[PDB]
Amino acid sequence: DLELHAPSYPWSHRGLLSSLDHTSIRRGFQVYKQVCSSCHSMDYVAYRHLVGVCYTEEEAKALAEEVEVQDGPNEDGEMFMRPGKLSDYFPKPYPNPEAARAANNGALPPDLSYIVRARHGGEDYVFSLLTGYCEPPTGVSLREGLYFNPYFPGQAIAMAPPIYNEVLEFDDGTPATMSQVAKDVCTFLRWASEPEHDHRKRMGLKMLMMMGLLLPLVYAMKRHKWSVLKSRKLAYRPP
Amino acid sequence: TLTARLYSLLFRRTSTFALTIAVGALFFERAFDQGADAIYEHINQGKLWKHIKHKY
Amino acid sequence: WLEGIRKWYYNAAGFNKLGLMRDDTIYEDDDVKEAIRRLPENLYNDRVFRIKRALDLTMRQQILPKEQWTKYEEDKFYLEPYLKEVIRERKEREEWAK
Amino acid sequence: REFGHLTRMRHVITYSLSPFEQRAFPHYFTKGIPNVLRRTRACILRVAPPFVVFYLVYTWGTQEFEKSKRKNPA
Amino acid sequence: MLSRFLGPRYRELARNWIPTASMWGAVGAVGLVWATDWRLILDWVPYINGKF
Amino acid sequence: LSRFLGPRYRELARNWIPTASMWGAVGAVGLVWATDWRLILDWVPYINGKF
Amino acid sequence: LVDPLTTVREQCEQIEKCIKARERLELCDQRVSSRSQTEEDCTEELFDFLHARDHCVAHKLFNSL
Amino acid sequence: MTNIRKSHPLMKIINNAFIDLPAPSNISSWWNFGSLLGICLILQILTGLFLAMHYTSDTTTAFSSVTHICRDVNYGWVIRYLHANGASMFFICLFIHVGRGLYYGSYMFLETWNIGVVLLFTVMATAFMGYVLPWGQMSFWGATVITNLLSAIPYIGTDLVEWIWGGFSVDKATLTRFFAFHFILPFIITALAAVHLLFLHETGSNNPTGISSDMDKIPFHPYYTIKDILGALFMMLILLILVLFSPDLLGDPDNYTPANPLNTPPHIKPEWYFLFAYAILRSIPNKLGGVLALVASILILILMPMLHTSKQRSMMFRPLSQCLFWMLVADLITLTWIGGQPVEHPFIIIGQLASILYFLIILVLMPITSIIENNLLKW
Amino acid sequence: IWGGFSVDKATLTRFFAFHFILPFIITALAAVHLLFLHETGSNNPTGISSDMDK
Amino acid sequence: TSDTTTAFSSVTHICRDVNYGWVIRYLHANGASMFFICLFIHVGRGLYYGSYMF
Amino acid sequence: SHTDIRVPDFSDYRRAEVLDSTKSSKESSDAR
Amino acid sequence: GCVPIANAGDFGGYYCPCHGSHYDASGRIRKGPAPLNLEVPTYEFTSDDLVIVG
Numbered sequence A: 001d002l003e004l005h006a007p008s009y010p011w012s013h014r015g016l017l018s019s020l021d022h023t024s025i026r027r028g029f030q031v032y033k034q035v036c037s038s039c040h041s042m043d044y045v046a047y048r049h050l051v052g053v054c055y056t057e058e059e060a061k062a063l064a065e066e067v068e069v070q071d072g073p074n075e076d077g078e079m080f081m082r083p084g085k086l087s088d089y090f091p092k093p094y095p096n097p098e099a100a101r102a103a104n105n106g107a108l109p110p111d112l113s114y115i116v117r118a119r120h121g122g123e124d125y126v127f128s129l130l131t132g133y134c135e136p137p138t139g140v141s142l143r144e145g146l147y148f149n150p151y152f153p154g155q156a157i158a159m160a161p162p163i164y165n166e167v168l169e170f171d172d173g174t175p176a177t178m179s180q181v182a183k184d185v186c187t188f189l190r191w192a193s194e195p196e197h198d199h200r201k202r203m204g205l206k207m208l209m210m211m212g213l214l215l216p217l218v219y220a221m222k223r224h225k226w227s228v229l230k231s232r233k234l235a236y237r238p239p
Numbered sequence B: 001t002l003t004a005r006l007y008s009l010l011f012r013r014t015s016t017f018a019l020t021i022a023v024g025a026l027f028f029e030r031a032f033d034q035g036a037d038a039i040y041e042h043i044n045q046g047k048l049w050k051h052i053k054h055k056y
Numbered sequence C: 001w002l003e004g005i006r007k008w009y010y011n012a013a014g015f016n017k018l019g020l021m022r023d024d025t026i027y028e029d030d031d032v033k034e035a036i037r038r039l040p041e042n043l044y045n046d047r048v049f050r051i052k053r054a055l056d057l058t059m060r061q062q063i064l065p066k067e068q069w070t071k072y073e074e075d076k077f078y079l080e081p082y083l084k085e086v087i088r089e090r091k092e093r094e095e096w097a098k
Numbered sequence D: 001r002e003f004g005h006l007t008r009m010r011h012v013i014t015y016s017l018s019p020f021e022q023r024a025f026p027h028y029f030t031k032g033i034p035n036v037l038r039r040t041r042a043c044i045l046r047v048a049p050p051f052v053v054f055y056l057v058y059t060w061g062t063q064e065f066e067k068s069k070r071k072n073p074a
Numbered sequence E: 001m002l003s004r005f006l007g008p009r010y011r012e013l014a015r016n017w018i019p020t021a022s023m024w025g026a027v028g029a030v031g032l033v034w035a036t037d038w039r040l041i042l043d044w045v046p047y048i049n050g051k052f
Numbered sequence F: 001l002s003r004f005l006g007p008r009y010r011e012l013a014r015n016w017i018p019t020a021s022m023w024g025a026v027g028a029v030g031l032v033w034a035t036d037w038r039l040i041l042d043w044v045p046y047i048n049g050k051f
Numbered sequence G: 001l002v003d004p005l006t007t008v009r010e011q012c013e014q015i016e017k018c019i020k021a022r023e024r025l026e027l028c029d030q031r032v033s034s035r036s037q038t039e040e041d042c043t044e045e046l047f048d049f050l051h052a053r054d055h056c057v058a059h060k061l062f063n064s065l
Numbered sequence H: 001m002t003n004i005r006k007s008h009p010l011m012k013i014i015n016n017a018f019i020d021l022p023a024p025s026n027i028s029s030w031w032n033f034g035s036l037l038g039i040c041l042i043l044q045i046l047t048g049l050f051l052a053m054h055y056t057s058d059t060t061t062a063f064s065s066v067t068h069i070c071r072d073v074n075y076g077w078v079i080r081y082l083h084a085n086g087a088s089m090f091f092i093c094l095f096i097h098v099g100r101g102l103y104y105g106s107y108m109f110l111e112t113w114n115i116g117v118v119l120l121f122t123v124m125a126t127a128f129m130g131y132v133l134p135w136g137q138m139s140f141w142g143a144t145v146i147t148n149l150l151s152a153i154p155y156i157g158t159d160l161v162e163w164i165w166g167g168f169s170v171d172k173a174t175l176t177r178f179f180a181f182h183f184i185l186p187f188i189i190t191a192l193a194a195v196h197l198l199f200l201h202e203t204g205s206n207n208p209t210g211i212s213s214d215m216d217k218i219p220f221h222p223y224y225t226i227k228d229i230l231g232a233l234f235m236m237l238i239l240l241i242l243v244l245f246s247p248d249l250l251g252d253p254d255n256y257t258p259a260n261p262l263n264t265p266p267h268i269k270p271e272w273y274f275l276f277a278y279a280i281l282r283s284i285p286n287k288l289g290g291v292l293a294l295v296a297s298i299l300i301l302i303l304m305p306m307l308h309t310s311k312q313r314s315m316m317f318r319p320l321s322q323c324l325f326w327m328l329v330a331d332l333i334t335l336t337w338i339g340g341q342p343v344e345h346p347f348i349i350i351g352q353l354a355s356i357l358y359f360l361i362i363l364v365l366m367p368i369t370s371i372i373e374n375n376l377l378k379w
Numbered sequence I: 001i002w003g004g005f006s007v008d009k010a011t012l013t014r015f016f017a018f019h020f021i022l023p024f025i026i027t028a029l030a031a032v033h034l035l036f037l038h039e040t041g042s043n044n045p046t047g048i049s050s051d052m053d054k
Numbered sequence J: 001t002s003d004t005t006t007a008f009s010s011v012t013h014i015c016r017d018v019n020y021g022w023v024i025r026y027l028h029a030n031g032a033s034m035f036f037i038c039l040f041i042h043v044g045r046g047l048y049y050g051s052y053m054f
Numbered sequence K: 001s002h003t004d005i006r007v008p009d010f011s012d013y014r015r016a017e018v019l020d021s022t023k024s025s026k027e028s029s030d031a032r
Numbered sequence L: 001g002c003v004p005i006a007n008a009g010d011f012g013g014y015y016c017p018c019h020g021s022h023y024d025a026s027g028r029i030r031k032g033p034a035p036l037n038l039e040v041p042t043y044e045f046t047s048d049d050l051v052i053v054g
C-alpha cells in the first residue's frame, strides 16, 4: 500500500498574508489552455473571472473569442456556432463524461475548478505529481497504458506525461522548464479553487489589526466596569 | 489636562458622545482602510494585479 | 495511619484555602435546606459571612494568606448534628409511609 | 427571585470604590504573574497526566499503524 | 395630543430640548451618510473623499 | 430506592395494575390500528378484507 | 535546455539519507529480480527514497524558479 | 409613575432575564459559553438564511449552487465559510458547555439539564443534515452510511431507512427533505433554548464553588453583559481566524468533488464533531449494539444527576474526581482521533478500550470515587 | 429585492428563503399579541368591562 | 426545488407523482385563502366591537 | 459602634491623580 | 474502477488491471485494496425473460 505524501513546498502564497504571484497566474493560465485543456476541463471558471486577475478586458475578450462556444437554438430550429465572449465558461473538451472516458484509456480527467481543494495536500500534491513521473520499480509491471506516479494513490495513474521540458513558449519569455510550468500551473489551479485568496488574506489582515485594538479596550472596559466587585474589601462585625 | 478639556467639551453629553463617535468613524474607516491596504501591498509587492497592470 | 490520608485529602480539597470548614461546601438539598434553617443565629451568620468571603475570593481568583487557612484539626462540624437529625426524621417519615 | 427574596444576612459591611478613581489594571503583571503561576501549580499535576498519556497513546498508534503497513520478509 | 400639550411650560421644555434633539438629528444624518456611503455628500468632504 | 417497596406500595401496585395494564392494552390496540399491522389484523374477522 | 529540477534532484540525492535509501533500493532490486517467481515489490524502498529526496528538494528549487 | 423597564409587559421578561437578573458574583469564564452558544446560533441563523438565499436543493444543481455562492455572489465565500466554521465553533462551545455542566455540578438543575440534552440532540441532527446539503462525495457517502445505520433496528429497520431516504437511496428526495428539515429545526432549537433559559432562571445559577450564591447575587447589566460581550469578541476572533486564514482547515477536501454514487471515497469519516460517537459505533461488532451504544453515548448525560453521590455539588473540591473527569476528557479526544483513523489493527483495540473506559468513568468510576472522598472527609 | 435586473433566478430563490423564514416571525409576533391581550382580557360584544362575569 | 428551471416541474411533481401530494398543495393554497378570510373577519371584529382600545 | 467602623485604605488601587488626601477630586474628575 | 476491462481480461470474465483484487469470471476479486468483488444485486429469477433485479 503506502501513500507517499507530498512534501510542503515553499509556495509564494503559502505565507500567512502572502497572495499569489498574479504574473505566475498569467503564465499558469496559458499552460492550462494549451496543455491541460486538451483533455481536462475547468467548467466552473469563465473568462469573466480572468479579467483583473491575470488579464485585462481586451485581452480577455480576444482570448474568449479565440475559442468557439455553443449558443442556444437559432431562429431556424438548430444549434448555431458562435465565437466566445466574456460570459462563457471554459470550454468542455469532451461532449459528455462517456465521451471523456472512451477517448482516454478508460479513466476520467477530473475538472480542475476544485482539484486543489479536493486532493489531500493541495498544490504540493499536484506539482509533485506532475514532476513525480519515473520508471516503475523492479517487481512492478503496470499494464500497457498505465503510467507510474508514486504520489498518485495506487501508483497506476492513466495520465500521459503532461509536462516535458520545452512544452510551450511563455509569452513573457520565461524558460519553459518543466519545473516552471508545473509551478505556474499549480498556482493557477490554486487560484481557480480559491479565487478570493487575495481578498480573504487582505480581510484577515484588517481583522488582525482592529481585533488587536478592540480586544484590549473592551477588556479595558470590562476591568473598568468590573473593578467595583474586584475591590470590594468586605468586613464582618457581629455583636 | 488635554483629557479634561476633551471630556468637558464633547464627552459630557451622550448625544455629543454619539456625534463624536460617528464623525470619528468617518475618518477612522478611511485611515484604517488606507493603512491596511498600504501594509498589504507592501507585504505583497510585485504580485498583485495593481502592481503588474502597467505591463499590458 | 488513616488520619494521614484524611489530612492529605483535606489539604488537597482546597476549601480550607478559602476559609471554609467542610460544612460550608455542602450541596443544598431539601434536607440541607432545612438544616441551615434550624441553625442558631450566630452560626448561621458566621456561615453566611464565610461563604461571602469565599465567593469574593473565587471572583478574584485568590486565596487567603497561609495563616488564615482553617486547620483540619479546627474544622468544626456545626451542621452534622442538625443534618443528621433531619435525616433521621426523614427516615422515620418514610418508614411510616411504608 | 428578584432582589429582596434572596436571603437573610446580618452584620456584613461592604465597602467599594467607583470605577472612576481606581485603576482598571492595578499592578497587572506584578500580581497577576504570581497568581497565574500559583493557579497553574494547583492544577497541573491533576490536569496534564491524562493529556500526556493520550499523547503517548496517539503517537504509539501512529507508528504501530504505519509499521503494520510496512513490508514483511518472505 | 391637543390643547393639553400647548402651554408656556411645554414651549419652554421644547426650547430646552431643541439643541439636544437637533444635534441628535445631526447624529442620525451623519450616521446615515456614513452607513450608506452617500457620495453626494461625501464628495464635498475633505480627506474622506479620496476613498472614491 | 429504599423508599419504594414495603407494605403500602405493593397494595398500591395491586390497585393500579389493572388500570395500567389495560392502558397498555389501549396503547397496543391504538398502535396496531394506527400502523395497520397486517400481522395482527390477519387474525380478526372483519378487517381481513383490507388486503 | 536544462531544467533546475534535475540539478536539484542530483545535488539532493547526494544527501546521506538518500544515500542509505538508495542502498536499500539496490538491495531490494536484485533480491526481487533474482527471485524468479517472487511477489515482492520494491515500491516501499522507492517510496522512502523519494520521500527523503523530495523533502530535501522542496527546500531548494523554488529559489531557482 | 413606574420604570418602563419594569412596567412594559414585554420589557418585564427582558429586564428580569438580562438586566436585573441576580447572577452569582464569582462566575468564572466557563459560563460565558452559555452566551457564546446562543450568539453563535444567531450567526448560524443569519448566515444560514443567506445561504438559503442562493441555493437550489436539487441533485443536479446543489453543488453548482454552492460553488456559485462561493465564487460569483458578492462576498458569498465569506457567508459560506463563516457558516461552516461557525457550526464547528458552535459544537466546540457545546462540548465546553457540557463539560462545564459536568464539572461544577450543574446537572442538579434537572429540567435545564434534560432540556440541554434535547438541545444537543437537535443540534447534532441539524449539523448532519447541513453537511448533507452541499452534495459532495463525503456529504453523500456519509449520509448513506449514517442513515444505513438505522437498518440495525429490528423489524422496522428497512422501512424506516427507506422512509428517511424518501426513496430507495440518498437522492433527490433525500436532499430536498433534508434542506427543509434543516430550515425548520434551528427554530425549534431557539424555542427550546428559550425554555432552557426559563427553567434556569428559576434556580439562579451554579457558581464554580457550588454553594448557593443567593446572598451574593449582583445585577446583570453593568456586569457579565460586558463580560459576555468580551467573550463574544474572543469567539469572533477564533471564528474569523478560522474563516480568513484557513477556511477548510476543519473539513475534508474530498467534499469538493461532486457527489458521484459510483465511487466510494478512500475514507468515509464524518465531520470532526461526530467521530466521538462514530468511533463508538465502530467499536461494537454488532450493528444493533453499535447503534444502541452510539445513542447511549449521548443519552448518558441524562443519568448524570442520578449517579451523583458526592455530598458536594461541585468538582472544585474533589481532587481524585477531577483526575477522573480529565481522564474522561482525554478519552473523548482519543475517541475523536480513533474515529478519524480507519479500522485497522492498532486502532480497533484502542477504540474498544476507549469506548469501554468512557462508559466506565461515567457509570462506575465517578460514583464509586465520589463515595471515596465522602468516606475520606468524615461523612 | 430583484437580485438582478429583473425577476429571475435570484428573486425566486430568495423569495423561497424569505417565505420559509417569515411565518416563524409571524408566530413570534402572534405570541407577543396574545401576551399583550392577556394583560387586559378580551373585549365582550357589549364593550363594557365584564370583570364581574368572567 | 426553488429554481426557475425546475420550480414548475417540481410543483407538477408534487401534485402528480407524490403520494397524496395534491392534497398537501391544494391544502396550502386554499388554506392561504381561508387564512386571509379569517384575518379579514378578525380585523372587522376588532373594528366593530372597539377592540382597538387595547 | 458606627464610630468604630472605617473605610479600609484603598491606596493600592487609586489612580495617580486622586491619591493624596489634601487635593480635591473635582480637579481631576474631568481627566479621569 | 481504474480503467478496467469490459468483461474481458486474463482471468476469464472480468479482471481489474489497474490495482490488485483482480476480478473473476463471476467477479470475485483476487487480492488487493478492493473492498469486495463486483457489486451484486438482489436478483429475482422467478421466471425466464424476467430475472428481476434492483
Ligand code: HEM
Pocket (backbone or CB within 6 Å): H041, H044, H045, H047, H048, H049, H050, H051, H052, H055, H066, H080, H083, H084, H087, H088, H090, H123, H126, H127, H129, H130, H131, H132, H133, H134, H182, H183, H186, H189
Ligand atoms: C443550528 C445551527 C446550524 C448549524 C449547526 C448548521 C450547520 C451546517 C453545516 C455544518 C453545513 C455544511 C456547510 C458546508 O459543508 O459547507 C450547513 C449547510 C447549510 N446550512 Fe446550515 N446550520 C445551521 C443553521 C442553518 C439555518 C438556520 C439555515 C437556514 C436559514 C441553514 C442553511 C444551510 C444551507 C442552505 C446550507 C447549505 C449551504 C452550505 O453548504 O453551506 N443553516 N449548515
Ligand code: HEM
Pocket (backbone or CB within 6 Å): H030, H031, H032, H033, H034, H035, H037, H038, H094, H097, H098, H101, H104, H106, H107, H109, H112, H113, H114, H115, H116, H117, H118, H119, H120, H123, H189, H193, H196, H200, H204, H205, H206, H207, H301
Ligand atoms: C442550544 C445550545 C444551548 C444554549 C443556547 C444554552 C443556553 C444556556 C445559557 C445561556 C445558559 C446560562 C449560561 C451558563 O450557565 O453557562 C445555560 C446554562 C445551562 N445549560 Fe445550557 N444551553 C445550551 C445547551 C445545553 C446543553 C447541551 C446542556 C447539557 C445537556 C445544557 C445545560 C445547561 C445547564 C446545566 C446550565 C446551567 C449552568 C449553570 O448555571 O451552572 N445546555 N444554557
Ligand code: HEM
Pocket (backbone or CB within 6 Å): I026, I030, I033, I034, I037, I041, I042, I043, I044, J039, J042, J043, J046, J049, J051, J052, J054
Ligand atoms: C397573525 C394573525 C393573528 C393571530 C394569530 C391573532 C391572534 C389573536 C387571538 C388568538 C386573539 C384572541 C381571540 C380574539 O379575540 O379574536 C386575538 C385578539 C385580538 N387581535 Fe389578533 N391575531 C392576528 C391578527 C390580528 C390583526 C390583523 C389584528 C388587527 C390589526 C389583530 C388585533 C386583535 C385584537 C384587537 C384582538 C382583541 C379582540 C378583542 O378584545 O375582542 N389581530 N388575536
Ligand code: FES
Pocket (backbone or CB within 6 Å): L001, L002, L003, L004, L005, L015, L016, L017, L018, L019, L034
Ligand atoms: S479497475 Fe475494475 S475495480 Fe479495479
